[PDB]
């Protein structure tokens with residue numbers, strides 16, 4: 001038979017499942033909704049582990065339970081009463097013999113030890129992967145340290161001592177590869193000559209590599225805490241989502257820089273060389289699976305100032321138009337081909353973050369926080385699972401590092417890019433559009449001629465890499 | 470076969486804009502949504518007895534990708550310009566959204582409607598007369614919608630389709 | 637994208653977590669933090685086919701030994717890890733092999749035998765003894781180092797191939 005349980009009067013997590021406290025989806029069960037008590041019971045269930053659920057729960061629980069209350073509930077979960085001696089044990093003791101204690105031993109082995117270990121696994125995951133709760137609430141950290149540091153008994157000792165050390169390390173807080181990174185490539189600008197760095201003087205291969213390292217680092221820095229609760233859209237977004245916003249602002253600045261490079265090149269022949277060079281950079285982004293970079297270029301080419309430059313695109317080689325067209329097709333039909341491509345490539349990659357943001361926001365806006373059943377309000381956990389499916393996908397692409405060497409000066413050049421200067425956004429984007437109208441006027445105004453601005457060769461070195469010994 | 474209309478939702482973030490398309494496309498009568506689902510943004514409807522397909526682009530949450538707005542907007546034949554009735558700044562943003570749409574579509578007469586969205590019970594700060602006056606100055610319809618009761622939602626989208634049909 | 641459920645099993649301290657984190661993050665973990673149960677995901681192209689690996693990293697400490705049936709039921713293939721400088725961990729392999737066979741009620745479960753810590757000179761389990769055991773199970777034997785990455789992709793992706801051909 002099943003093990004008997006403590007009375008639900010002394011231990012709340014022994015209440016029977018019912019539709020008034022838990023609802024399952026239609027081989028472990030998947031929870032649609034439940035009370036917080038039932039969610040914590042299943043988070044730490046004696047019959048099976050559920051590591052996905054642990055991640056889902058710890059990522060999303062703050063929408064229905066405060067951190068201080070979660071800690072109280074898992075401590076309550078941990079403190080399981082042991083059953084009293086059975087009739088057979090009583091009779092043995094009355095005869096001066098040692099009881100077999102079969103039911104007690106089974107309950108320790110099959111209920112207490114698994115539940116307690118799974119409570120500790122929640123604590124371990126909480127500290128290792130969601131430590132921001134403790135950074136933001138020092139008293140919560142004190143309570144966790146005290147709880148872990150006062151767990152007695154030898155069955156849990158190895159993990160209690162380990163978790164104590166992990167906490168202490170987190171309070172005061174290296175890559176190896178299958179090959180060597182390729183040699184850094186140089187074009188007109190030579191190493192150390194940062195004052196000459198520009199779109200056409202750096203090597204297009206190395207522009208794409210260093211932007212990919214930068215954009216990969218920005219992608220990898222975004223934590224789920226910046227996403228759950230749609231906090232990057234709310235009034236405190238600069239406080240709650242700073243790494244996400246830094247990432248988006250880099251993408252916006254690079255797109256605007258591409259546009260500025262194009263429309264401030266007034267000579268038609270020179271501007272063709274600029275657009276051609278940016279499409280070459282896009283080709284290397286594609287080779288590197290840097291989809292953020294691909295869409296940075298596509299967004300620039302389809303901006304109002306650039307899209308209308310028919311005389312420029314007329315002179316772009318057909319093969320390059322085809323590259324740009326196939327990159328643009330990734331975004332068509334609600335990113336259908338992008339999504340399929342992302343799911344097919346071999347990482348490392350840099351995903352485009354915007355689709356994740358829209359899907360998290362719409363999942364949170366389009367589903368209710370609670371389900372009402374039998375007069376009770378149950379936490380709608382299916383909604384939180386959907387959000388954590390998205391944050392899990394984000395995290396899966398944050399693991400793989402690029403095997404590319406940083407060039408500190410090129411990195412600094414792109415970190416410090418500031419195409420808008422001190423101008424406000426409307427002022428600047430109107431400037432870009434007025435430049436577009438200047439360099440290629442609306443029909444029937446004639447096309448003017450403009451002097452060259454570049455004193456160095458415009459011929460691209462191409463985007464196939466070189467390899468000296 | 471049937472006509473497909475590509476509609477684009479534009480407006481300030483952080484103030485409930487996404488509720489408009491969610492409430493339209495939703496199982497009207499079950500409050501649930503999975504936006505990752507292929508064609509969670511396509512809906513076959515009958516407007517004035519003529520069946521058509523609505524394809525709605527709502528990039529809610531991507532407002533900080535400001536340099537992508539042109540490309541997103543160019544996909545659209547008609548536009549819902551949405552502000553929140555309790556956020557005056559989102560109402561003041563409408564002028565620049567309209568100017569940007571006109572530039573991207575290269576037309577002074579782009580099908581569009583102005584939508585004032587009630588996203589919560591916080592106090593209204595944009596009176597309907599203010600919004601009606603703005604819409605009249607632009608020559609476009611004004612529709613008010615509730616983010617919770619679905620009121621006005623069908624009217625907003627159907628009015629925009631009529632603007633496209635009568636362009 | 638086909639999904640594969642891989643489970644890493646073996647005695648405490650043999651390097652199950654270090655192997656998994658090296659595969660997932662290209663990082664070697666120096667600390668010895670005993671695992672309760674961790675799970676990782678990795679999209680990777682293997683033999684030209686994209687798949688999604690779900691990797692369950694399990695507890696080797698004996699205090700968790702009563703909690704294994706639940707993860708052995710879910711797994712589709714098992715990395716059976718010992719350390720080549722730890723003869724007791726090699727002797728523990730057959731206990732994992734037999735439990736997996738019992739739980740899955742099958743003589744034909746995808747498995748790979750992994751001798752980890754091959755960067756260390758002071759070996760106590762000879763390759764021949766481990767290879768003999770692997771042959772008796774009908775499975776490949778791959779020596780690995782979570783520290784240097786030697787053999788790591790080979791071990792995990794060989795297991796994927798055995799699930800694919802199962």
Ligand SMILES: Nc1nc2c(ncn2[C@@H]2O[C@H](COP(=O)(O)OP(=O)(O)NP(=O)(O)O)[C@@H](O)[C@H]2O)c(=O)[nH]1
Pocket residue numbers: 646647648649650651652653654655665666667668669670671672694695696697752753754755756780781782783784
């Ligand atoms: N030299 C060397 N040390 C290794 C290697 N793999 C793991 N180690 C070291 O061995 C120790 C235990 O590693 P760990 O991955 O935690 O082992 P585990 O099998 O996951 N332990 P558990 O079963 O308790 O979770 C750590 O100090 C780790 O750095 C390896 O290939 N070489």
Ligand SMILES: CCCNS(=O)(=O)c1ccc(F)cc1C
Pocket residue numbers: 298301302307313316321324325326328329
């Ligand atoms: C009608 C969509 C065009 N967008 S595109 O594919 O990026 C492209 C393609 C070729 C070209 F010469 C210019 C552009 C801007």
Ligand SMILES: [Mg+2]
Pocket residue numbers: 652653654669670671693694696
């Ligand atoms: Mg481990």
Ligand code: NA
Pocket residue numbers: 555556557558594
């Ligand atoms: Na206001």
